């Protein structure tokens, strides 16, 4: 950590001028841990609902998505035990290959997380790797339902 604090520059706030609502850059990304939330914001397809004299902006979609992500992450062991049926006191780990369905699901989730994380970075990805910004956005949009399935199948078969 000290070597990287020395040798690698992190958050040059002096380069990043003081906040002003009228000013902005092109990067506009959060740290890599919130990059998946930001990528969800970017990729979700601008679906807004307007009830009687009201608005339901696209922000609620991502908020509910984050809520679902956290709920599922917190409740997985209970979800897994309800699904499989195993409540036995387990003290010996099991190799990820020995549990194809769970390793497949974890690979699918990691694929979705990586897709969202790179979708948040689509701006710089498009800039450096010459790919149109619309193409990157729609690659993320399609992949977030295609790539998880591909990775699930591949990981399941790989474990077996």
């Amino acid at each position: 950590l000290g070597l990287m604090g020395g040798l690698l520059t992190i958050n040059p706030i002096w380069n990043l001028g003081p906040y002003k609502p009228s000013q902005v850059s092109a990067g506009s990304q959060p740290d890599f841990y919130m990059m998946w939330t930001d990528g969800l914001i970017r990729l979700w397809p601008a679906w807004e609902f307007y009830p009687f004299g009201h608005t339901i902006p696209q922000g609620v979609w991502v908020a509910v998505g984050m809520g679902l992500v956290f709920a599922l992450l917190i409740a997985y062991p209970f979800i897994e035990k309800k699904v499989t049926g195993d409540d036995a006191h387990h003290n010996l780990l099991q190799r990820p290959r020995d549990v194809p369905v769970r390793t497949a699901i974890g690979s699918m989730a990691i694929a979705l997380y990586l897709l969202l994380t790179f979708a948040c970075m689509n701006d710089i990805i498009a800039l450096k790797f010459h790919i149109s910004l619309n193409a990157t956005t729609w690659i993320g949009r399609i992949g977030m339902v295609v790539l998880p399935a591909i990775v699930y199948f591949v990981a399941y078969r790989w474990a077996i």
Binding site: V24, A26, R42, A46, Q58
Partner: peptide
């Protein structure tokens, strides 16, 4: 818009023709 890559068509009323923005 740099934050989430939404484009608005200035020629028409600045309606979003891409990205998360819907208004």
């Amino acid at each position: 818009c740099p934050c989430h890559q939404s484009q608005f068509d200035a020629l028409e009323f600045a309606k979003p023709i891409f990205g998360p923005a819907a208004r």
